[PDB]
Amino acid sequence: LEGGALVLADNGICCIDEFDKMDESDRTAIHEVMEQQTISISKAGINTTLNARTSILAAANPLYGRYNPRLSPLDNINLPAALLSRFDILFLMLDIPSRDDDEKLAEHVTYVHMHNKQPDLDFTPVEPSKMREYIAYAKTKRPVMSEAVNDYVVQAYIRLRQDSKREMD
Amino acid sequence: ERVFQISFFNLPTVHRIRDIRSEKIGSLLSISGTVTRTSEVRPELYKASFTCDMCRAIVDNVEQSFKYTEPTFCPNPSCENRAFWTLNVTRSRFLDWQKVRIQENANEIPTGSMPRTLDVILRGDSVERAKPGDRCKFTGVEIVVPDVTQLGLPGVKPSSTLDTRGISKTTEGLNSGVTGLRSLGVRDLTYKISFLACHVISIGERDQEVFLNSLS
Numbered sequence: 378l379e380g381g382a383l384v385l386a387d388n389g390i391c392c393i394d395e396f397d398k399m400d401e402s403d404r405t406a407i408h409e410v411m412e413q414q415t416i417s418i419s420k421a422g423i424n425t426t427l428n429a430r431t432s433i434l435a436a437a438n439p440l441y442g443r444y445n446p447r448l449s450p451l452d453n454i455n456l457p458a459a460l461l462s463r464f465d466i467l468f469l470m471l472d473i474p475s476r477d478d479d480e481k482l483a484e485h486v487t488y489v490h491m492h493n494k495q496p497d498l499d500f501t502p503v504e505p506s507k508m509r510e511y512i513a514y515a516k517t518k519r520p521v522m523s524e525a526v527n528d529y530v531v532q533a534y535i536r537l538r539q540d541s542k543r544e545m546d
Numbered sequence: 547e548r549v550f551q552i553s554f555f556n557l558p559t560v561h562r563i564r565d566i567r568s569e570k571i572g573s574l575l576s577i578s579g580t581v582t583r584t585s586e587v588r589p590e591l592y593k594a595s596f597t598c599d600m601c602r603a604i605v606d607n608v609e610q611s612f613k614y615t616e617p618t619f620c621p622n623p624s625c626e627n628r629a630f631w632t633l634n635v636t637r638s639r640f641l642d643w644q645k646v647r648i649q650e651n652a653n654e655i656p657t658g659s660m661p662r663t664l665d666v667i668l669r670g671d672s673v674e675r676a677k678p679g680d681r682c683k684f685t686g687v688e689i690v691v692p693d694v695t696q697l698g699l700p701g702v703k704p705s706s707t708l709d710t711r712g713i714s715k716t717t718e719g720l721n722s723g724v725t726g727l728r729s730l731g732v733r734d735l736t737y738k739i740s741f742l743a744c745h746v747i748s749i750g751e752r753d754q755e756v757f758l759n760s761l762s
C-alpha cells in the first residue's frame with residue numbers, strides 16, 4: 378500500500394505548482410481533502426481510510442496568457458467555482474507596466490548578477506534556523522477564544538453580507 | 547458393466563464456503579454458491595488396461611487415484627518387468643469430467659470482503675448442469691488434492707513445475723510441506739482443499755400430438 382503526496386504531508390504544506398494543467402483525477406483528491414481530510418484508498422480489496430490533514434499552497438496560470446478585461450474571474454482560469462470557494466485565500470498578482478517599478482526591478486536583478494551577494498540594505502535577514510525555531514514553537518502553542526471577541530465577528534459578517542448583496546457587479 | 551453412481555440430496559443443514567475446514571475432509575456435505583466459470587467435458591481414465599512389452603500379457607482394472615499409474619508386477623511371475631507398458635486405450639473405461647469455479651453469495655459476503663473461491667468437481671452424469679452466473683446448491687464429499695507434478699509424473703513435459711508467474715514470497719516456507727516419502731525423494735508434498743459433487747440443484751414444440759401427451 379503506497380500513499381500519495383497529499384497523505385505524505387501530515388500537519389504540513391503541499392505546494393502544487395502548475396495547478397491549471399493538473400488532471401481531474403487529482404481534482405477528486407483535492408476536492409475530498411478540503412472536505413474531510415481523510416483519503417479513501419484504491420479498490421484493491423483493502424477498504425482503508427488514511428488521515429490526510431494538510432494545508433494547500435496552489436500556484437495558478439490564467440487561461441491563454443494574462444489577465445483579460447473579461448469581467449468574470451471564472452473566465453480567467455479553468456478552475457470550478459466550487460473548488461475556488463474551498464480555498465481560504467485567493468491572490469491575484471497581475472503584471473502591470475509602470476515606468477518606476479521596472480527601474481528598481483532591473484537594478485535589483487542586475488546587482489545580483491554583478492555581485493553574487495544580495496543587495497545590502499537596512500533590512501536585516503533573520504537567520505533561517507531562528508525562523509524554524511520560532512515557527513515550530515508557535516505551532517506547538519494552543520490559543521483560546523472569549524465570548525466578547527466573537528461578538529464583533531457577527532457584526533463584521535453581517536456588514537460583509539449586506540455589502541455582498543449589492544456587491545454583485 | 548455400467549459404472550453406477552449414487553446421488554444424495556435433502557441434507558438437513560447447508561454450509562457456506564467460509565465454513566470449509568480440514569476437519570470435515572472425507573465427510574458428506576452440502577454447499578451453496580454462485581457459479582462463475584465452467585470448463586470442457588474431458589474424458590477421465592477410470593479402469594486402465596495395459597500389455598506387457600515382452601510377454602504381451604494383458605492387465606486390466608488398474609485403479610488410478612490422481613496420476614497416471616501403470617502396473618508393477620507382470621501377471622506371470624516368470625517374467626521380470628517393472629515398467630515399459632503400453633496402454634490399451636480402446637479397452638480402458640473412461641468417464642466425463644468437468645471443473646467449475648464458484649464463489650460466495652451476495653448476502654454472505656461481509657461489508658468489505660474479497661470473495662472466497664473453491665474448485666468443485668462434477669463427474670459422470672452431472673456435467674453441464676451448472677451454468678455460469680447461476681446460483682446452485684452442490685452436495686458431495688470434501689476431499690484434498692495433492693500436487694502431482696512433484697510426485698514424479700512420467701513425461702518430461704511437467705519439467706519440474708515450470709511456471710510463468712512468480713509465486714508468493716509470503717508463503718515461501720510458510721506452507722507446510724511433508725517430506726520423507728521415497729516417491730517424493732527430497733521433495734515436499736503440498737495439499738489444497740477442493741470439493742467433489744455428486745448432485746447439483748439450482749436455487750437462483752409446435753406439435754399437437756406430443757403436447758397432448760404431457761398434460762394430465
Ligand SMILES: [Zn+2]
Binds near residue numbers: 599600602626
Ligand atoms: Zn511380462
